[PDB]
RNA sequence: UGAGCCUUGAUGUGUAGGAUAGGUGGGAGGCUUUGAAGUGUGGACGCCAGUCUGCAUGGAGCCGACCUUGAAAUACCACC
RNA sequence: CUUGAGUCUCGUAGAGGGGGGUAGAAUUCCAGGUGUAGCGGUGAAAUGCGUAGAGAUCUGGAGGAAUACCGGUGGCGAAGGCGGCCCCCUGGACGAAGACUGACGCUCAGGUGCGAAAGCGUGGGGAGCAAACAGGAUUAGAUACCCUGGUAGUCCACGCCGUAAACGAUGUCGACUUGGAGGUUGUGCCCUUGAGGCGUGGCUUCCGGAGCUAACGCGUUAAGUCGACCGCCUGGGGAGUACGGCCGCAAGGUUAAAACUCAAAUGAAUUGACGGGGGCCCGCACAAGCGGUGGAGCAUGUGGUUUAAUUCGAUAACGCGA
RNA sequence: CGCGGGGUGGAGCAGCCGGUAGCUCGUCGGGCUCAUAACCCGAAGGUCGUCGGUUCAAAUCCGGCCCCCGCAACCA
RNA sequence: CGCGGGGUGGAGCAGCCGGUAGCUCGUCGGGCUCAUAACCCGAAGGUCGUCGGUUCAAAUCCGGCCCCCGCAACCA
């Protein structure tokens, strides 16, 4: 595999599960990991800790690519948002940019109905 | 909330800054709001109710303040 | 309780070695307020243990204790629909107690004949890092690890 | 992109162990100015101990039955 | 005659209406790249989608619907309602001065029109959402709430429907009666010496006086003090139902009884009690621990059954009166 | 009369080779429960309609009989 | 009869060189749990159908037999 110095970390942070995907700067995904994949289910995988460990796993996976610089793109609302980036930092990439990329419509599609609980 | 880490800037500081930016944006809040459909009526009601509450806080409480507690 | 925290009561150190911890252990062991018998048993356990491992009577005991002390235990919050066991850092006073209690339990369980002998055996096991108390400790730790997501 | 083949190279951890022993027969010394041991490392394999090999440097020696072992040297060798 | 009512002049603010363009974000799908085992979902799960390569991620395309921020107890409209930006057609409101008309006004049974959402008809459209429906949960059951899907419908055109807690639960028009704090939109003067100072008009939010009110409350935007016109009520149920008429493609709307039946039904406020309302606090209430009961045998009391009688009582009763 | 389903624990639905002998509601038992329809634990109820035989496994494969079904055909 | 797959822990799917001897659900113990399941930890169950041999590694490569598959061909 071709080594690459700089890339992006996409952090899809949902309410139920965090997904971290490291990619090159062009768009092509190198590796990924998830809180659900990291051995957490239901209550556990919707937590900051879980997200962090997913991030760590992802980092581990893209060791062979030899990535030093990293820009982070954080998507969605969740626990795995601050935690994940911290984890990434710990894992030892130079974090270059921290971007928020939550899809906010400018009033477009009707959301689903409100839950009655 | 696009941000770039400055030269010889700590990670933690950067993170904090990012968080602040996010807060300013009100992105999370927006997301929360758009999770489910709010009927127009409901939306109206909240807005008016909230306004009323605010008004109550401002004036009635001020009146109370004039008189000492003990 | 709700209203007021209270200062822990005064405990006398045991006559043989002059130790608070030892005294506490003896107390824990004791049943039906027969302290003397319990203390004798404890002493016996110590002596045998000392013979086995060398060192001193007290030092060996301490070492044994060390291998069964829990860094972290869990508690049940249960805020959700289902129960969530949450880990908590267990304080110095409590940890020591817990280990002792576990040891005692192990001793009680054990299939050897005399109580003192059983206790000694348990201590030895603890020192070596096998046995019942140690297992219990591991389990406790394991649970905490499992539920580390909650904090 | 799959896949054969004349050919010349590499590849092979039961534990005894100089340590990454496939087996049979002919055998006691093969290689060394169409350049030997030691050093620098480019690319491969890997059971992390090492093994083969490119180019540079070096210029007069490394490896044998060995002590062990159910089987002995990749001292040269042909058959696969 | 000019004070009401209207016309003309110049401005002003506006999601007022109709028509036609366009912009950007986001969702969905399609095609392709990267990539590898999960994704999704919940209180927890499962159905569901995934190694036939999903989810994630990037590129390109399609199409529909709605318009983040601005945005406000802000604005406009008779009400219903109206929200990206641009243009075309178009209705009303307000102010400034003048000039004109000269009571031309107010209200309105029948009548006529406009009238959310759903619904209907014909023809288009269809991304998202979603009655119905299906499956998965939950449950005693769950024809629900939750989850995964999902069709009418929502969108457009032209017709119909004519109702909503269509509410300020407050008809319209006019006059008069103490105050304060704002918002919005004009406009006159003033050294705008500055975001200001002093007025004067329109619409508007809150508080409160007199008065009014069953009280709650209303209070110059009246539910006060009066006048003009209209609409409507006459105990609760039966019933806004039946019959008949009129209207409607239908759904149904509208008009609108009676028998029979009860002595109530209601409104506001009051004291409690209660709440799977909220705040503060306590108790071996939980938590933290130690020892029990529930199994055994016996003692003992009770229930029951039996008995000639198994004395009567207790049932925070049951080693209780004893 | 002939031909396809088969015959059970208070009723019902029981895993192609005969060795598995049930599950639902029900009744009792006891605490939960402010109250139960509860959740949960355990307990009494058979013949496998019947008469026989192939075989140690038989109700469980076959010969006949009694019924319940279903059949479709008939009727001077 | 001839020819391609191979034959296992209660069932199933097990990493080209023979030295690795499993994973899922299952049963039991415990941990947590209101519950149940999910979840965590650990524990009993082999022959590798079989008979042999190349070799210290063999079920793990080969010679035969018993079956399960699959084959496609045949039948006076």
UniProtKB/Swiss-Prot annotation, chain A:
Any one GO biological process: cytoplasmic translation
Transmembrane domains' residue ranges: none
Gene Ontology molecular function: any one: structural constituent of ribosome
Keyword match Iron: no
InterPro entries, alphabetized: Ribosomal_uS11, Ribosomal_uS11_bac-type, Ribosomal_uS11_CS, Ribosomal_uS11_sf
SUPFAM superfamilies given in the database record: Translational machinery components
GO-annotated cellular components: cytoplasm; cytosol; cytosolic small ribosomal subunit
Annotated keywords: Methylation, Ribonucleoprotein, Ribosomal protein, RNA-binding, rRNA-binding
Additional facts recorded: Has been predicted to contact the N-terminal domain of IF-3 based on footprint studies; exactly how IF-3 interacts with the 30S subunit is controversial.
Function recorded in the entry: Located on the platform of the 30S subunit, it bridges several disparate RNA helices of the 16S rRNA. Forms part of the Shine-Dalgarno cleft in the 70S ribosome.
Subunit structure: Part of the 30S ribosomal subunit. Interacts with proteins uS7 and bS18. Cross-links to IF-3. In stalled ribosomes contacts ribosome rescue factor SmrB.
Database matches in NCBIfam families: PRK05309.1, uS11_bact
Family that this chain belongs to: Belongs to the universal ribosomal protein uS11 family.
Protein name in the entry: Small ribosomal subunit protein uS11
Organism: Escherichia coli (strain K12)
Record gene name: rpsK
């Amino acid at each position: 595999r071709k080594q690459v110095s700089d890339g992006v970390a996409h952090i899809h942070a949902s309410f139920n599960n965090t997904i971290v995907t490291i990619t090159d700067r062009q768009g092509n995904a190198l590796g990924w990991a998830t809180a659900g994949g990291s051995g957490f289910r239901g209550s556990r995988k919707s937590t900051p800790f879980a997200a962090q460990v997913a991030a760590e796993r992802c980092a581990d996976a893209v060791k062979e690519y030899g990535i030093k610089n990293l820009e982070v793109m954080v998507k969605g609302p969740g626990p795995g948002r601050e935690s994940t980036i911290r984890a990434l930092n710990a894992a030892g990439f130079r974090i270059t940019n921290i971007t928020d990329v939550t899809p906010i419509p400018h009033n477009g599609c009707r959301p689903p109905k409100k839950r009655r609980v | 909330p696009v941000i770039k880490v400055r030269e010889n800037e700590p990670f933690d500081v950067a993170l904090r800054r990012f968080k602040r930016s996010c807060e300013k944006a009100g992105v999370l809040a927006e997301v929360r709001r758009r999770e489910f459909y709010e009927k127009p009526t409901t939306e109206r009601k909240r807005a008016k109710a909230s306004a009323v509450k605010r008004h109550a806080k401002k004036l009635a409480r001020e009146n109370a303040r004039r008189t000492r507690l003990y | 309780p709700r209203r007021r925290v209270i200062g822990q009561r005064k405990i006398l150190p045991d006559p043989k070695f002059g130790s608070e911890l030892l005294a506490k252990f003896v107390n824990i062991l004791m049943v039906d307020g027969k302290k003397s018998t319990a203390e004798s048993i404890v002493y016996s356990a110590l002596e045998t243990l000392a013979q086995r491992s060398g060192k001193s009577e007290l030092e060996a005991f301490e070492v044994a204790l060390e291998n069964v002390r829990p860094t972290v235990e869990v508690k049940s919050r249960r805020v959700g629909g289902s129960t969530y066991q949450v880990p908590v850092e267990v304080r110095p006073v409590r940890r020591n107690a817990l280990a002792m209690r576990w040891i005692v339990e192990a001793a009680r369980k054990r299939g050897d004949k005399s109580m003192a002998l059983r206790l000694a055996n348990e201590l030895s096991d603890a020192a070596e890092n096998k046995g019942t108390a140690v297992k219990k400790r591991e389990d406790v730790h394991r649970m905490a690890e499992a539920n580390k997501a909650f904090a």
